[PDB]
Subunit: 157 residues, 6 copies
């Protein structure tokens, strides 16, 4: 079989993320979404919420699973018995950094990284920006999954 | 009438900023410079000084006013009864980030953002770099307005 | 009054173009779309068709007019009694070239150029690509105005 | 099964190309290299030579086949019963153009495009540059497959 | 001694070029400006004029000489008994292409390429753009050396 | 004589750094590596270790010396009686920032900055990434000098 890992901190998962999950799932036999715990105490949602939110946003993709990532992405990829990372590109991606890590990741573990541009309508949303805009009262509900909108409403109220 | 907002933290306003103010004022009936209070306690000049400095540097532009910005830029723009942001581009601008925010700002409030490249002679000055260079004794007086040079001299001595 | 020129060869005008026309018209008192005749004998549509197509695609914008451009863009801008160019940015824009021409245009004639990112859904269409995709049988009708789709159908059949 | 198409004009196939073929073949059940005939009469090697050269350079990859591409890449991809393009990124790739075509290709046919950075040691070779450097007597043999070096020697002598 | 080559087609040499020549001459014992004959019959000035123009624009730099380049830049560099190329960066430079050629040039001949940003006031001039703007009547005399302005006047009249 | 300064925090010096040192030393009479103490208490290796590591990694370059930098880079350059900075470019370099500082540095002190792309095989290593990858158990020993690998082993154990 063929497999890819979609790594990230998904705090929260946006519809740009989901778009990329959907494309990974159509093109690989299995997809694993690896949720990577923020280095220090820094999140808006705790791990369980992030997992639930990804899970709840991906029920339509039966070949995808959600797991917490630990250590080097490449080590996790290898443990999933895979050799591919799939990363989404959006407006504001630091692509040069992504490239530097792609080359490093290939160097140290032979893992390939495939990049895919997210749909234009979801290309300007990031977890960071969605949070900052929502905290100051802006409406980003069209760019997040409903499971995320539900949890974002509660935590704001 | 037609109107644009030039948002920023102007800590301090440079002559790159002024160049952009000047171009906004020539092309729109009214210009509002929105000074956006640094999120946490982080400035070099307090709000009043920043306002004074912008005011003192823009006496030649009668169709421009200076106001403190609050909340989402787009909310402020709408409150000024305008629908346009004018942002300057210089060497070192994170243009991809600017673009991501431009698309988000259009999405949530229908506000357009116009980008204009600052004059080559003012294209390498930023508030950040002007401060760091001046603190370590370098001469950046040719890239800042005289009202700013006056206040930068005092605070360094 | 305030005014901007939207220059280009509009062979054919796409909905990315129109998006930009719409934004120019909302923010300036008058907009002039300047159709710039291809240097040598190189178009798909002749000048009259290009004019008709822009005209037919902009009936909802009463403050915009369509004129054939001649010579230096800046000379045309000045002749329209304006001092601003408005250019759209899309995926694939040579922005560095646009910037070089913006600085040159300011140098030689004091004309400012404002850049505005086109809507994400129209950000991957260009006249060039729309033509190449349509010639080889692909459907680009969602990214062109109906006046353009009508004329593109006929010329393909 | 899962499948990807690696499109291009491979005139000639370089070791940057092969690097990408190798990565596609490891991650997808079948890979098809689509050789796309230059629009007008413009090649250095004719189609048969290009096919032979790709074939001869990919004998170690049993899950890959070489076919001549016709029309829209996306139409060929669909005909191969696949929905993925795999493209290599190297120094000098026009990535903005690649992105514009990726979004267009997704729009018109639902085909995803995955981008993968070629190995650093093969990242500065292109068919174009390899030809220009070799014609003027430079040694690019370390950056081309041996089947290509053999045919490039003969045609130069 | 230390040495660098400044390669190009200098049709015509601009003041951006001269700025770079000046910086090369201050930092290396000898500088050679290599004028590289356009591949086909394509120039505005013939070789002799280009040489004269560079010569006449560099009389203040006694450690610089002007020579016609032939073949691979790296072959010329080696023949000058040097191992360094100095290239200017301006607005509109295709830097990715410059980088690809820098890596190729190092690969095939061990020649290093140093890049230096041209002065902001000369950063938007190119030979190409200066010619196109001047042909259509624009004034680019502030961005070209006087020897070039003299010859550009005559050829336009 | 001719001279260049290679500034940085070299925490630790990588083989990308050394590649650049080597190229500077071949092209300039003297090279000074300026180690610039991290602003606050933030390093992995203290100054003495950084100096030792650079020293131990550059014994093959007799025309290079290592010194601790203080204040503005340009002030240090001037004190070394030089007027040139040599900076390496790798994947992930913030080149726009480098350019902004190059223009500022030229403005305030007349110091030129030359940029040189590091060898492809060392183009994805940075001090930052090498540390993060090594802390989480990855093998980056092929991208660091042996003096650095020795000290990185000890500090990890
Ligand atoms: C690969 C990696 C870049 C992806 O994880 P990510 O946290 O989702 O980050 P992304 O690149 O996807 O996008 C933005 C990211 O900036 C991250 N970020 C965290 N703190 C940030 C800071 N103070 N400022 C800027 N960005 C920050 C965001 O977390 C992260 O997403 P978000 O900010 O939108 O919430 C991250 O570096 C990582 O992988 N950690 C596991 C590390 C690993 O394997 N390292 C070896 C490196 S080759
Ligand atoms: C739009 C915005 C980017 C412009 O404000 P700005 O503070 O002047 O910042 P700029 O983009 O113009 O230029 C550099 C900026 O980096 C800002 N900055 C502040 N802290 C910084 C950090 N720790 N590191 C990097 N940059 C930082 C600078 O403040 C700011 O200017 P300066 O650093 O030269 O003093 C800023 O994000 C903002 O708008 N705040 C109001 C927010 C809003 O509407 N958000 C919804 C987002 S779509
Ligand atoms: C400003 C200018 C760049 C805009 O006109 P434009 O033709 O619409 O071109 P754009 O930059 O908008 O976008 C793509 C352009 O590439 C143009 N183009 C024409 N021939 C091309 C070639 N052989 N290859 C690449 N692009 C080409 C396209 O015409 C043009 O649009 P299109 O290709 O999608 O049909 C054009 O250079 C111009 O302005 N001519 C008037 C010139 C002037 O004032 N020059 C002084 C220069 S500062
Ligand atoms: C997708 C496509 C960009 C890839 O094919 P490619 O010819 O290998 O080109 P690449 O992007 O891979 O890399 C460089 C390319 O520039 C191409 N090129 C051809 N003529 C060129 C010109 N006069 N100048 C610049 N580049 C040229 C090169 O052929 C090609 O490779 P090469 O130059 O190194 O020999 C090409 O556009 C294509 O796909 N043709 C089939 C088209 C299709 O489906 N079009 C719908 C568009 S969304
Ligand atoms: C290195 C090289 C890029 C520099 O020469 P240059 O002609 O001055 O070109 P530059 O990169 O400096 O800047 C713009 C260039 O585009 C060149 N150019 C020529 N025809 C062009 C075309 N049809 N369209 C786009 N640009 C063109 C310009 O000549 C040239 O300067 P100009 O256009 O402003 O008159 C050129 O490729 C060369 O070096 N020829 C000698 C080649 C060599 O050694 N090749 C081995 C390659 S690694
Ligand atoms: C010129 C300068 C950019 C080079 O020093 P450098 O520390 O080696 O940094 P580099 O640009 O080379 O590369 C990455 C750098 O990010 C630096 N960095 C330090 N803290 C960082 C932060 N919190 N986040 C992002 N990067 C950081 C790194 O130190 C530094 O190298 P490293 O991160 O790989 O350990 C640095 O700004 C400097 O020069 N200090 C002396 C300053 C001076 O003259 N200033 C006047 C400015 S024109």
């Amino acid at each position: 079989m063929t497999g890819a890992v979609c790594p990230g901190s998904f705090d929260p998962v946006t519809l740009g993320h989901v778009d990329i999950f959907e494309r990974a799932a159509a093109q690989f036999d299995e997809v694993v979404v690896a949720i990577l715990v923020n280095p220090a105490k820094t999140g808006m949602f705790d791990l369980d919420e992030r997992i639930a939110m990804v899970k709840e946003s991906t029920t339509h993709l039966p070949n995808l699973r959600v797991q917490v990532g630990h250590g080097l992405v490449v080590d996790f990829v290898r443990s999933c018995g895979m050799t591919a990372i799939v990363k989404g590109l959006r407006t504001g991606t630091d692509f040069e950094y992504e490239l530097q890590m792609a080359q490093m990741n290939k160097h140290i573990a032979g893992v390939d990284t495939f990049f895919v541009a997210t749909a234009p309508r979801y290309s300007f949303v990031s977890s960071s920006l969605a949070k900052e805009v929502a905290m100051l009262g802006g409406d980003v509900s069209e760019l997040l999954p409903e499971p995320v909108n539900r949890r974002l409403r509660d935590r704001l109220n």
